[PDB]
Design a protein around this ligand. Structure first.
Ligand SMILES: N#Cc1c(-c2ccc3ccn(Cc4cccnc4O)c3c2)n[nH]c1N
Ligand SMILES: N#Cc1c(-c2ccc3ccn(Cc4cccnc4O)c3c2)n[nH]c1N
Lengths: 200, 213
């Protein structure tokens, strides 16, 4: 059984959401949420004050506080497995140029905190990352290596393109070996790092 | 000026995109995002989009005939066809930059175990096709990946959405819950501030992303 709370200034974005409940909270309920960065630089930083009040009410010492950020530890399938057995996830979604670092630092004095990134690209805020994290985690909740090769279904010939004949053969050993070969070839081509080789 | 067409059996999932788009960008004709229900192109009264995998195994595979008809209608020779898949090439910021100048992206969102491979292979004989993954985790389908791709791409298109890791950021108040903003940031010594930030970036990168080194 898992509870997930998502905190955002754009609750409208989270709309795409009995063993798990997901609740979305408008951060503005606890209040200008942003100001210029100390030290200078472009854009705005979310003030810690409003976040502190929201998280005070929502979190407990048992909470795993998840903070999407481009500067986070990588969120991976291993992370998804790890979080799948948590009782309570709180996902703090930033906007602007991010959240004052003291929010995570203050939270870590009371609960476990995880700053994570879902990939090496830049988003406008944490909401899309929250949707990715929720989806990856929820499909693993109790009671719910190499790249996959290609898949095929009927008809066996389509637009003059045939399903690989081995897949029609009924020979499990040959099919397994072919699928292994397809996966090896794909992994080498697209993700050689997974097999311990240099990236392109 | 970019057109994005998304094809999915869950068009409601792409609602956040339409909500993120500023009216000024749309009325300026800078961007148009359209979402299409794949079932519009099904052949049967049961609106079937999936079937059992050749060679056996768990799960289902999306039908090539349905997808073929959908992409035939939506794509042209100039389309960049984007196919999210956990077996894809990595989608990165470089990818987002490259795609930000495209006239027409079509994002084909799969579900189940994915789409019959002949769909992409056939499309690739007459348009540019890109199978990509947004990260090293498994999703239920391509919709969340489409949201990520659309956001990362469109934020790079001028006026549409409104190395090393970045170190910590701070703003008002100068003291909060016993924690002071690092005094160097209030020093007015901007060369020193830059050096402090560089070191913070170096430390965070070593700790969180040693692969980047
Ligand atoms: N997880 C994940 C992320 C994010 C992501 C997450 C949360 C926020 C909150 C604000 N922004 C924009 C932003 C933050 C910091 C610096 N510059 C910016 O433009 C975010 C980006 N971007 N890319 C990922 N993989
Ligand atoms: N981009 C990206 C993705 C996806 C992703 C994309 C598209 C589809 C279509 C079906 N599924 C589910 C699925 C595919 C293969 C095997 N098992 C499954 O459960 C997808 C997953 N998962 N993880 C990423 N980084």
């Amino acid at each position: 059984s898992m509870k997930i709370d998502v905190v955002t200034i754009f609750p409208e974005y989270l709309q795409p959401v009995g063993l798990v409940d997901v609740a979305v909270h408008d951060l503005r309920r606890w209040t200008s949420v942003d100001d210029s960065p100390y030290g200078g630089g472009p854009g705005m930083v979310m003030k810690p004050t409003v976040w502190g009040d929201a998280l005070d009410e929502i979190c407990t010492s048992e909470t795993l506080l998840v903070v999407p950020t481009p500067a986070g530890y990588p969120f991976t399938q291993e992370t998804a497995w790890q979080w799948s057995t948590e009782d309570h996830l709180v996902i703090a979604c930033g906007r602007y140029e991010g959240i004052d670092q003291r929010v995570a630092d203050d939270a870590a004095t009371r609960m476990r905190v995880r700053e994570v990134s879902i990939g090496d690209y830049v988003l406008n805020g944490g909401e899309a990352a929250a949707l990715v994290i929720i989806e990856a985690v929820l499909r693993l909740v109790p009671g719910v290596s190499l790249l996959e090769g290609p898949s095929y279904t009927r008809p066996p010939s389509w637009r003059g393109m045939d399903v690989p004949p081995v897949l029609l053969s009924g020979d499990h050993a040959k099919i397994a070996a072919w699928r292994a070969e397809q996966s090896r070839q794909r992994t080498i081509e697209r993700r050689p790092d997974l097999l311990g080789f240099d990236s392109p």
